[PDB]
Amino acid sequence: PISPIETVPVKLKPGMDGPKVKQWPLTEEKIKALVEICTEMEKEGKISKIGPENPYNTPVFAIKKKDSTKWRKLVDFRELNKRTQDFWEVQLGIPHPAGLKKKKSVTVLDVGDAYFSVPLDEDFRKYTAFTIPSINNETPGIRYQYNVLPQGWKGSPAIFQSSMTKILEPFKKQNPDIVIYQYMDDLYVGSDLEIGQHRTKIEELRQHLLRWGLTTPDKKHQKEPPFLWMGYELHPDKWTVQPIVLPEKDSWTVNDIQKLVGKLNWASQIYPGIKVRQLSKLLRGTKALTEVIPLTEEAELELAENREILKEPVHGVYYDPSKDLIAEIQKQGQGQWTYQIYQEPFKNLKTGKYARMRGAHTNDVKQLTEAVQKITTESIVIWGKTPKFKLPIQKETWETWWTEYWQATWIPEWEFVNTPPLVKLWYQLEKEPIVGAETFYVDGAANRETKLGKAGYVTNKGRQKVVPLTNTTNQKTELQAIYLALQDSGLEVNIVTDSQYALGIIQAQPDKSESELVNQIIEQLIKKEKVYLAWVPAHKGIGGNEQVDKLVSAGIRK
Amino acid sequence: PISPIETVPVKLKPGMDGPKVKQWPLTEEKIKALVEICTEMEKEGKISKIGPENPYNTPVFAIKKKDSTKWRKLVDFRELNKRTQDFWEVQLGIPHPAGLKKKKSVTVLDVGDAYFSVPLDEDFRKYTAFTIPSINNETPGIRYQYNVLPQGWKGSPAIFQSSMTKILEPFKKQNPDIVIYQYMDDLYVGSDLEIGQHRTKIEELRQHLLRWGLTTPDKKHQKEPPFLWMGYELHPDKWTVQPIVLPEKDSWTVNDIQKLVGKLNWASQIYPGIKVRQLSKLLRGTKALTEVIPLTEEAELELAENREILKEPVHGVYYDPSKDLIAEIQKQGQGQWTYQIYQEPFKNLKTGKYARMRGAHTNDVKQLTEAVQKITTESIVIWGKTPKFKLPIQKETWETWWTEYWQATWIPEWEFVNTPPLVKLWY
Numbered sequence: 003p004i005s006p007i008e009t010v011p012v013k014l015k016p017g018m019d020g021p022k023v024k025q026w027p028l029t030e031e032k033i034k035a036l037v038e039i040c041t042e043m044e045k046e047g048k049i050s051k052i053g054p055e056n057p058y059n060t061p062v063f064a065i066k067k068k069d070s071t072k073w074r075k076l077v078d079f080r081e082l083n084k085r086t087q088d089f090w091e092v093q094l095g096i097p098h099p100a101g102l103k104k105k106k107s108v109t110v111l112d113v114g115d116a117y118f119s120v121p122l123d124e125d126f127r128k129y130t131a132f133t134i135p136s137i138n139n140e141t142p143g144i145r146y147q148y149n150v151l152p153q154g155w156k157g158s159p160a161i162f163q164s165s166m167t168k169i170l171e172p173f174k175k176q177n178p179d180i181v182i183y184q185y186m187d188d189l190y191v192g193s194d195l196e197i198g199q200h201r202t203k204i205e206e207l208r209q210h211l212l213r214w215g216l217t218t219p220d221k222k223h224q225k226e227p228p229f230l231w232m233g234y235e236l237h238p239d240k241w242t243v244q245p246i247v248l249p250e251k252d253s254w255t256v257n258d259i260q261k262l263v264g265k266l267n268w269a270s271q272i273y274p275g276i277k278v279r280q281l282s283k284l285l286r287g288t289k290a291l292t293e294v295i296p297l298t299e300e301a302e303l304e305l306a307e308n309r310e311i312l313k314e315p316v317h318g319v320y321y322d323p324s325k326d327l328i329a330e331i332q333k334q335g336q337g338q339w340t341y342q343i344y345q346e347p348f349k350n351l352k353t354g355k356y357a358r359m360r361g362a363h364t365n366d367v368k369q370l371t372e373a374v375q376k377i378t379t380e381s382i383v384i385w386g387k388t389p390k391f392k393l394p395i396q397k398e399t400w401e402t403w404w405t406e407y408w409q410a411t412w413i414p415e416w417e418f419v420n421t422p423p424l425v426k427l428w429y430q431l432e433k434e435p436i437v438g439a440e441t442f443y444v445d446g447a448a449n450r451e452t453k454l455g456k457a458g459y460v461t462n463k464g465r466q467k468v469v470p471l472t473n474t475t476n477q478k479t480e481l482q483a484i485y486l487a488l489q490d491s492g493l494e495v496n497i498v499t500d501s502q503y504a505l506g507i508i509q510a511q512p513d514k515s516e517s518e519l520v521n522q523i524i525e526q527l528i529k530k531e532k533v534y535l536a537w538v539p540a541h542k543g544i545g546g547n548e549q550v551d552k553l554v555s556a557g558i559r560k
Numbered sequence: 561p562i563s564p565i566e567t568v569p570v571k572l573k574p575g576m577d578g579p580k581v582k583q584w585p586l587t588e589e590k591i592k593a594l595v596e597i598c599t600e601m602e603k604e605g606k607i608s609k610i611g612p613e614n615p616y617n618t619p620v621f622a623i624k625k626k627d628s629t630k631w632r633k634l635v636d637f638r639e640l641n642k643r644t645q646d647f648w649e650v651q652l653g654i655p656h657p658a659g660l661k662k663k664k665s666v667t668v669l670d671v672g673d674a675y676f677s678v679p680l681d682e683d684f685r686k687y688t689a690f691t692i693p694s695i696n697n698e699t700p701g702i703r704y705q706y707n708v709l710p711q712g713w714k715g716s717p718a719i720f721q722s723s724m725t726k727i728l729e730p731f732k733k734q735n736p737d738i739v740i741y742q743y744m745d746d747l748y749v750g751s752d753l754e755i756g757q758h759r760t761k762i763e764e765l766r767q768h769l770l771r772w773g774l775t776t777p778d779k780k781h782q783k784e785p786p787f788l789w790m791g792y793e794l795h796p797d798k799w800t801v802q803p804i805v806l807p808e809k810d811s812w813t814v815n816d817i818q819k820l821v822g823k824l825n826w827a828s829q830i831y832p833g834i835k836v837r838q839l840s841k842l843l844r845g846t847k848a849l850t851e852v853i854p855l856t857e858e859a860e861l862e863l864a865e866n867r868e869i870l871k872e873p874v875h876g877v878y879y880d881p882s883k884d885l886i887a888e889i890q891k892q893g894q895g896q897w898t899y900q901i902y903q904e905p906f907k908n909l910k911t912g913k914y915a916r917m918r919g920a921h922t923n924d925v926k927q928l929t930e931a932v933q934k935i936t937t938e939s940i941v942i943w944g945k946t947p948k949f950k951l952p953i954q955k956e957t958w959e960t961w962w963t964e965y966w967q968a969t970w971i972p973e974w975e976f977v978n979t980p981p982l983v984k985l986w987y
């Protein structure tokens with residue numbers, strides 16, 4: 003029958019009128035078959051006949067399905083659907099397992115065809131009328147119309163899941179001891195009642211739902227021991243993602259390169275190490291999903307190293323509001339960093355990583371933060387609290403970044419714990435020019451039209467030099483010109499830059515970059531005792547910078 | 561209670577749907593701080609529970625408006641506003657008192673509790689839909705709609721405007737000298753009487769409001785002999801530019817004269833009146849960044865002539881009412897914040913430096929968020945509108961902790977500039 007629930011007012015878009023999707027005359031062998039299944043739905047009262055004053059129509063196709071020992075009905079109103087108002091989002095948000103607390107038993111119930119138990123606005127049913135012919139050329143319209151939430155119509159999923167949450171309102175009051183969570187047409191119930199005692203309630207609810215059409219034949223609640231949902235696998239005290247099968251073969255194309263870098267990432271929720279720099283790096287191949295990609299030596303290193311991990315599987319534990327969430331972050335790769343959250347001594351709750359795709363020159367202390375940050379942003383979202391942080395870094399290191407970094411960053415709870423690559427500052431510039439030191443009035447340009455210019459510099463002591471560098475462009479030259487000033491110079495040198503980019507990059511005390519032009523400066527700044535970058539603009543009447551500007555004319559006349 | 565009334569039929573702008581922003585996820589201490597509120601709020605009849613048919617949304621946050629007092633709601637009405645009161649900026653536009661800025665002392669009161677009466681057309685309620693969340697998208701959240709006057713909305717003081725002009729009549733009679741701008745949900749009242757007297761006139765108004773229409777002011781103080789909430793005693797009559805001063809280094813070391821010549825030239829854009837030539841000439845000559853260099857006599861004149869020209873300001877101090885104003889803040893050092901409200905580059909209508917030393921409660925995502933409201937009140941007073949910000953902060957860090965420290969009632973629109981400084985020097 004139909005669950006008598008307070009109906010909710012669905013409407014069509016303003017100015018718009020219901021469907022007229024007429025249909026190409028159906029299969030007689032399946033047209034009668036429309037009557038031999040509809041009549042059941044009609045006597046079940048879900049389908050009622052009319053014919054004269056309601057013009058609207060839609061498509062009633064018919065088909066068969068999985069292990070069908072019977073013929074099936076089909077009428078997707080994706081026409082009417084777009085001519086149907088917009089509803090509340092079904093559900094954006096997935097109860098990611100790790101957040102879940104342990105309830106002693108949790109059945110899962112099929113919510114059958116609970117769509118038809120619920121009804122449809124007595125007005126919005128006119129726009130649901132469909133049509134069935136009889137013989138290629140015989141009977142005059144056998145028109146039916148819907149009374150209950152049809153099976154494909156923008157609103158059902160919501161009007162539906164609204165209704166149910168109403169239908170489970172009393173029971174959820176009287177039972178403030180047994181959690182429920184709908185899922186499309188499923189219901190996870192989960193008390194702390196011991197097996198059977200739990201069986202008492204599923205049975206009560208089952209009967210409750212039985213009153214207003216929510217027939218739940220999930221006998222004593224059919225509940226497969228493990229849980230695949232959303233690709234998860236849920237157990238009474240553990241969750242995961244079991245079937246992650248990183249394929250192995252020869253032609254590794256963009257399409258599969260992606261897929262390979264999908265599972266891999268997915269796996270990271272629980273697998274304490276899964277790296278994905280390399281494979282993702284090359285993965286930036288555009289338009290050629292079908293075209294093969296040469297899995298590079300390092301992208302190979304990653305692929306199976308992970309396999310090593312991904313064979314030895316992992317069990318994820320459930321949340322328990324007795325303890326503060328704890329956070330450990332350690333850097334594994336290069337751009338790569340990792341974090342796993344626990345509150346108890348050592349069986350995992352959650353795991354994840356943070357890889358930099360900032361642009362081209364990000365610092366390392368900064369880089370801890372962004373990771374840290376991501377976790378707060380994630381814990382807030384799941385557990386509604388904030389991991390106390392534990393991070394490989396003296397405050398001596400941290401506090402020196404904010405007292406001197408421009409953008410600001412805020413750091414919640416965090417305790418230091420010694421581990422391997424200790425997060426720190428390798429080189430630190432000065433404030434005042436180092437006294438007496440050889441002042442390098444550097445420069446290095448190159449022609450736009452001719453990628454080849456010449457880095458070089460000029461010291462206080464008439465000490466010039468220059469280096470012809472091909473395949474260059476101003477940018478790659480004002481840095482190159484710094485490096486050189488960093489080579490023929492003492493252990494305590496001052497430097498004058500024409501550029502900004504250059505003074506930008508170095509001034510931010512960055513460490514790793516993937517190129518040797520920048521990188522080499524870093525390792526020169528590191529081994530050193532007292533650099534001093536400084537900027538005065540080009541051709542700014544700065545004769546001091548003028549010479550550096552005219553110096554290079556021994557490789558271009560102008 | 562049962563005391564209904566006429567509805568100013570409210571509507572949208574041309575061709576637009578309602579706000580459909582999505583509810584940012586908030587804490588546990590908070591998801592409850594709102595369930596209670598909102599749940600008081602249904603008994604009270606202000607808000608109602610809704611169904612699917614309504615698919616709009618507006619973020620609801622939660623804060624503690626008095627030195628961390630009691631939980632209070634804070635709908636981010638930033639998107640339904642544009643989607644209504646911009647066409648309503650014209651229909652019921654509460655006029656801006658350009659003399660308020662001049663009053664030697666100002667005070668701000670929360671007349672927002674008042675709107676709480678006027679019912680809203682059930683043809684518009686649809687759009688104030690709001691949503692309170694759950695910890696891990698487990699519970700589908702509680703969905704409410706507004707039945708009175710969405711108190712966050714830029715079109716509510718506008719509706720409940722007449723009712724205010726009225727409740728404010730005798731105050732204006734008695735004291736026809738105090739200004740009263742009614743922006744959003746606050747009333748800036750400006751007097752020009754003895755430090756303590758301005759406060760006097762205010763307890764008065766906080767009281768005349770009271771007895772009359774149940775509109776309630778807020779108990780700024782009692783006997784409370786503690787150093788909490790010094791007071792919102794603004795004084796909009798002060799705002800001048802000068803600490804963009806050149807360090808006068810009688811030890812003109814080259815390095816010194818270098819940076820100096822440096823700054824000086826950027827000024828050429830902000831102050832078309834700059835001619836740093838014969839000064840540059842002094843640095844012409846690869847030399848040690850630690851020596852002296854103060855020659856070109858005529859250049860020295862350039863040092864005074866500029867040092868003094870920095871006092872006679874730009875053309876761009878012209879407000880163009882069809883130009884949204886931009887505020888840019890800058891971590892200048894430890895505590896010292898800075899900002900400059902402009903509309904067209906270098907033509908800046910206002911500058912200043914927000915000061916609150918670290919060590920105390922240095923949360924950078926505090927001194928700024930605080931410095932985002934000050935700067936933003938500084939504009940209700942003046943230009944009568946809030947500036948879109950450029951925030952020296954990671955989108956996220958800010959989206960995480962703004963709502964803690966936000967004690968305010970409105971929310972300026974913003975943007976975080978991962979883009980560095982040239983300006984973060986001494987300015």
Ligand SMILES: CC(C)=CCN1Cc2cc(Cl)cc3[nH]c(=S)n(c23)C[C@@H]1C
Pocket residue numbers: 097099102103104105108181182183185190191192229231236237238239
């Ligand atoms: C994740 C989904 C669909 C949950 C629905 N569902 C069942 C479930 C299943 C396991 Cl293995 C642990 C669980 N822990 C909690 S709390 N729940 C839970 C309750 C909700 C009511």
